[PDB]
Ligand binder design. Structure first.
Ligand code: HEM
Length: 392
């Protein structure tokens, strides 16, 4: 019987099995939720090998009849979204619009984190740091980044509990939501009041006849895809980083006292983060040797990020947060190679600012329920608790 993936929906603790698997079988046959076979890769060396070799293709994971990690929740072409962006001549533009350096942006993040936190302090403990802090901070950020009205955020957010499912079967709601969100974005592109952020930029490139080969659909897809990827990734990461920090009171206290180390703290929280529920999928486009396995053309490979990130061969004392590591950014939390996360800078600043605000307003933050009372979302592309009850 094949080892089934994923092993655990819990985002607070790495299963003991990962260390077992990594040492003895850093590439191992598994079965996914669709019933497909796959190669799960779990050492830093093999994970990096896979991500650095472009013949392990992201685009081709959408190929018809390919073994699948999970059901598509987007059109097959949209799996190649970053490639379409590059081909449309929109790459450095997209990347420029999603940098945290934008005028006023970091102060907006800061003031938004502090306002959310003041509201929670007024309502009284317990507070839910996912639904009433991390996710709203993520959503407010991405509305600003995209240049769309803040009041439009909640509804785009609504789609995400389905869009980012990791399902054995197709999801009818995913298509309905996708089509509505695409239509919304299309409308944003023609709205002359939208002059800032990613959509403001994309909108004026759309008016340019030099971009006449670029469909309206792709422009709109970029907005929907970046909003969703950024909101789900930042909100989910911050949420489970807060659990990591809460469980390490002396770290909490150290960062509160020495906020200059908060970036180093966040980098370690990224390294040990369990937010990705599944390995990153790739399809082999050739026969390629990975460890003791010849991966065959057409086979699915899953790059287990926490495999690499907890690998003591690369990170000594891997379960420990150490702020003085010599190569602290070398984890795979943002991936590697061709598909390295284009939002990584913004991801770091969202978490840095969110944590700094929280530590200053709630220096005594702690869980308000036993950790085993958290409800872990299942069959989802991220590991998150439904609610994160705290007191302070
Ligand atoms: C802590 C926050 C974040 C984490 C941990 C994270 C993680 C990742 C990872 C691991 C990948 C690589 C996927 C792969 O190679 O298969 C990725 C790619 C991606 N991320 Fe992020 N991400 C974060 C924030 C963001 C933000 C803020 C945005 C946009 C606003 C974003 C947009 C994207 C997009 C569009 C891709 C696909 C790139 C491609 O296909 O080439 N992410 N992210």
């Amino acid at each position: 019987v094949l080892l089934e993936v994923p092993f655990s929906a819990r985002g607070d603790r790495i299963p003991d099995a990962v260390a077992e698997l990594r040492t003895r079988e850093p590439i191992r046959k598994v079965r996914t939720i669709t019933g497909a076979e796959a190669w799960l890769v779990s050492s830093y060396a093999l994970c990096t090998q896979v991500l650095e070799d472009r013949r392990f293709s992201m685009k081709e994971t959408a190929a018809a009849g390919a073994p699948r990690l999970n059901a598509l929740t987007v059109p097959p072409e949209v799996v190649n979204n970053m490639g379409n962006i590059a081909d449309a001549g929109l790459r450095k533009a997209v990347m420029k619009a999603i940098t945290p350096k934008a005028p006023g942006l970091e102060q907006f993040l800061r003031d938004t984190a502090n306002s959310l936190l003041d509201n929670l302090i007024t309502e009284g403990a317990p507070a839910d740091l996912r639904n009433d802090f991390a996710d709203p901070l993520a959503t407010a950020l991405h509305c600003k980044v995209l240049g769309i009205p803040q009041e439009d955020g909640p509804k785009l957010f609504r789609s995400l509990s389905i869009a980012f499912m990791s399902s054995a079967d197709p999801i009818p709601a995913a298509k309905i939501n996708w089509d509505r969100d695409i239509e919304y974005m299309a409308g944003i592109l023609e709205n002359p009041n939208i002059t800032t952020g990613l959509m403001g930029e994309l909108s004026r490139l759309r008016k340019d006849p030099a971009y006449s080969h670029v469909s309206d659909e792709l422009f709109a897809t970029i907005g929907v895809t970046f909003f969703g990827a950024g909101v789900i990734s930042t909100g989910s990461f911050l949420t489970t980083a807060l659990i990591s920090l809460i469980q390490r009171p002396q770290l909490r206290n150290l960062l509160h006292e020495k906020p200059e180390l908060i970036p180093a703290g966040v980098e370690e929280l990224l390294r040990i983060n369990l937010s990705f529920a599944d390995g990153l999928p790739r399809l082999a486009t050739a026969d390629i040797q990975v460890g003791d396995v010849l991966v065959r053309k057409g086979e699915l490979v899953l790059v287990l990020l926490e495999g690499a990130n907890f690998d003591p061969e690369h990170f000594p004392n891997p379960g420990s947060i150490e702020l003085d590591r010599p190569n602290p950014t070398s984890h795979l939390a943002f991936g590697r190679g061709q598909h390295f996360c284009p939002g990584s800078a913004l991801g770091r600043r969202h978490a840095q600012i969110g944590i700094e605000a929280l530590l200053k307003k709630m220096p005594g933050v702690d869980l308000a329920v036993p950790i085993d009372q958290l409800v872990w979302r299942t069959r989802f592309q991220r590991r998150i608790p439904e609610r994160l009850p705290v007191l302070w």
